[PDB]
Paper text:
The enzyme, pyranose dehydrogenase (PDH), from the filamentous fungus [name] (CcPDH) of the Basidiomycete division, is composed of a catalytic [name]-dependent domain classified as a member of the novel auxiliary activity family 12 (AA12), an AA8 cytochrome b domain, and a family 1 carbohydrate-binding module (CBM1), as defined by the Carbohydrate-Active Enzymes (CAZy) database. In the catalytic cycle of CcPDH, electrons are transferred from the reduced [name] in the AA12 domain to heme b in the AA8 domain, which acts as a built-in mediator and transfers electrons to a heterogeneous electron acceptor. Therefore, CcPDH is thought to be involved in the extracellular oxidative degradation of the plant cell wall. Here, we present the crystal structures of the AA12 domain in its apo- and holo-forms and the AA8 domain of this enzyme.
Numbering used by the authors: 241 to 649
Write the structure that this text describes.
Amino acid sequence: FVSCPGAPQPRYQMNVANGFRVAPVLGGLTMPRGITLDTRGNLLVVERGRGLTGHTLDANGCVTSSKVVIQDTQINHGIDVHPSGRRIIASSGDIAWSWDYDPATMTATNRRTLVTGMNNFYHFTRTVHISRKYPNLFALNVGSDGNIDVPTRQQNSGRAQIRVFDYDQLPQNGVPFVSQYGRVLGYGLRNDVGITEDRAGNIHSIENSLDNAYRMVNGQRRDIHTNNPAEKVYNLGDPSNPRAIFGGYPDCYTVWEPSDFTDSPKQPGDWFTQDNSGQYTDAWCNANAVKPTLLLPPHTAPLDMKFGLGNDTNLYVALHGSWNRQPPQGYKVVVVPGQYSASGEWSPTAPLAQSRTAWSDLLTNRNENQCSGFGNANCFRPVGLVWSADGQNLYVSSDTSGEVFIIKR
Ligand SMILES: *[C@@H]1O[C@H](CO)[C@@H](O)[C@H](O)[C@H]1NC(C)=O
Ligand SMILES: [Ca+2]
């Protein structure tokens, strides 16, 4: 394999790990965000500002036709297909809806309002993940309204958190996100756009963390934002038994670079607070917040993640790239090694404190330090991931370049 019929050349140089090939399958798209495959293996793409588009594939995974499945200018990121193949869920910043779906024609009908009231203008994506282990359940993310959204200390804020809803008991008129119907799976999660599940059905989420981090040292604010805090994954466990795991936001953050803490011995993965004073101290965080399972580099902006299939026991993560770092970093897809327990729970191979060097590049730009999150990007910016059912093809969207790629084994 070299390329797909009729497909454009890539907008930017693209490097993929030895053993794989990459090529565009689509270009000229409108802000492609979340992507998935339906039960016929068709590609569905949220083109933010246009709607959900559907694309039939050939034997090589290349596109043979394109249509508009949902004509809607508000759906902005989230998409998932129910395991039955006959229902889809997609969301605006404010509302999650379902549609009846016919994969034979890629046709969505009978829009139904599920969950309401979620809008904010700061973190406005509403990731959807339908549980495969419990197909009546679905999770929705609402990120913080601001860098440091103090009300998110409370679950009932409705932000920086993931709730799980029982579709099969959901009122047909739909319900507010903050309601008894939305069981809090995790809160204190600043912006957890990527959500997936392991073979045991545990929900794993990944986070975009704090901007412009500082640390108070001797009553003076020390800028530590270049290399802190870490981006990070949480294992939120069983969505049929939600218990409101607290991830530490808006007070507690995760160390990436210990050297920045000149008066406090830290290791990667430890908690820190910016002021380390009052109630919400480093020690308070250790007693009251649950640690992540793995780290990724500051500001790299994970937006999706997916486990490998078949023989592959890795985690794959789309890093959209930074804006709040110089030089910039991310703008890639990475691989995190892991393993499954006897009952199917995924964990990383590296200990948390050793995880800074555990991950590897899969798909990269020419030079991440030449990319930018301000002005022209000069780079593709990964958003969404999905594996083909055979585990042989990994699709990757890039919103700002209008592209979807195929990575082929
Ligand atoms: C998975 O199997 C393929 C052959 O089908 C092989 O080439 C590859 O080494 C295997 N990978 C792992 C991680 O065992
Ligand atoms: Ca950030």
